[PDB]
Amino acid sequence: HGEGTFTSDCSKQCEEGIGHKYPFCHCR
């Protein structure tokens, strides 16, 4: 729970299914 403060979380970007523009995010 929370709000849209910080979206730049690597794990979060991977859970969104991107990992794009994120050099530290190699995900599935």
Q: How was this structure determined?
A: NMR
User: How many CA atoms lie less than 13 Å away from 24 in the CB half-sphere?
Assistant: 6
Dist. CA 20–CA 28, nearest whole Å: 12
**Alpha helices (H) along 1-28:** 10-16
Dist. CA 19–CA 3, nearest whole Å: 21
Return the sign of the alpha-carbon dihedral for residues 7, 10, 14, 19: positive
**3-class state of residue 13 by DSSP:** helix
* Contact indicator for 27, 19 with CB cutoff of 8 Å: yes
The single-letter code of the amino acid at 7 is: T
Dist. CA 25–CA 9, nearest whole Å: 9
